[PDB]
A paper describes a structure:
As expected, Mis16 adopts a β-propeller fold, consisting of 7 WD-40 repeats, with an extended N-terminal α-helix that forms part of the histone interaction pocket.
We first solved the crystal structure of S. pombe Mis16 both alone and with the N terminus (residues 14–44) of histone H4 bound at 1.9 and 1.8 Å resolution, respectively. The ordered N terminus of helix of histone H4 (H4α1, residues 28–41) sits in a concave pocket on the outside of the β-propeller fold formed by the Mis16 N terminus and a small insertion into blade 1 of the propeller. The interaction is predominantly mediated by I35 and L38 of H4α1 forming a hydrophobic interface with Mis16 residues L40 and I416. Positively charged residues R40 and R41 of H4α1 interact with negatively charged residues E365, D366, and D369 of Mis16. Overall, the structure of S. pombe Mis16 and its interactions with histone H4 closely resemble those of the homologous Schizosaccharomyces japonicus Mis16 and the human RbAp46/48 proteins and exhibit a highly conserved interface, which has been extensively described by others. Our structures of Mis16–H4α1 and Mis16–Mis19C show that the C-terminal α helix of Mis19C (Mis19α2) binds the same site on Mis16 as the histone H4α1 helix. The results showed that the Mis19α2 was capable of competing out histone H4α1 (apparent KD 2.5 μM), whereas the reverse experiment showed that H4α1 could not displace Mis19α2 at any concentration tested.
Author numbering:
A (entry chain A): 12 to 102, 118 to 269, 272 to 419
B (entry chain B): 30 to 44
The structure:
Amino acid sequence: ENNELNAEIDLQKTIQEEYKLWKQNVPFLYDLVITHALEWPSLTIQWLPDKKTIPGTDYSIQRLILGTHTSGNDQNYLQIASVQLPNFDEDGSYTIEISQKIPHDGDVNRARYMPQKPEIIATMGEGGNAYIFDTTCHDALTTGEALPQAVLKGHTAEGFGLCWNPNLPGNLATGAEDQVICLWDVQTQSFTSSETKVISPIAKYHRHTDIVNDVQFHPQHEALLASVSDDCTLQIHDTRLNPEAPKVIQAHSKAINAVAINPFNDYLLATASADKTVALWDLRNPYQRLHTLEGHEDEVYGLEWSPHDEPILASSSTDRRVCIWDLEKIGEEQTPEDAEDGSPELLFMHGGHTNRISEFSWCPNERWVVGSLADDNILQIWSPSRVIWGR
Amino acid sequence: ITKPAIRRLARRGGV
């Protein structure tokens, strides 16, 4: 084929040209940029919540959950990386160490620590199985990392939806390509045994008619679960009732890849879609689309509210960009020239990656620090300049 | 180039 190959050549040329310009502009756009090459690409990233300060040094040690997807032959791993970060305070020699390498069955599609017990990590893995690990544990006989404490059997195809209930310890939700949502009750209670425990769902939802891409519990209401899907619906589930029926919203006309509930509000929810937009919703009046955030140039896949600032939201796309939105600029006037760059609330575009964004994660221990991964093995840890977000 | 130039640069990603 003659158009495909030369179009891919031209795309790579564009990427290399724009990466060179991005590097030239970094000193004006960032307060920090740390880049680390990984041995394997990761589909997932999450900051763990611990921070270790060292008296007499100007940096702290923090940690990231990572995974692998050799997806053929090589053994996969749930990994924990330890990274130095500078200690900010108000007005490039930093290392990484892969400190834990835990054998994992198949690609690590998604991994999340339990908020109430961060040493417990759930993953979505081979064939649809979910797995539970205790990262403080060891092999029965050796110092090698432990086998899964539990395997969660229920999904019949692989999935990427995974989230813990921040208000009900050990409560887990998963969504997968079998179009099903499984609810689980994980009792770390039970990991006093010489063998991996097998766990079955406490509940299953067959309410979507296509791949379930993302699930999230409302940060402050333990019975409330949001789900989004390739069937182009956002669904709000009450986990007390019986599969009664959820609230269904035709939120976009193309696939919905991610969902994110504001951690500071009761009501504000955002969705990210293959239609290249992020949409905002008020849970008290969920059938009215409040606003549509424009700026990405391809499908939007990642979405996470800032854990420190109520109006700050971030998204990521196969356009290779991570965008940061500031909802306080809703309504501000802009010229049609500026509008070509995006909606008024678009605050910052991170252009440091040179392939599709896999996932990113806000650093809970520092303000305005993001860790992001792309498919070409690159991890970047970065902070936009206080010139841009300050005041 | 003060704050407003930097803010268009930021929205464009410096690219």
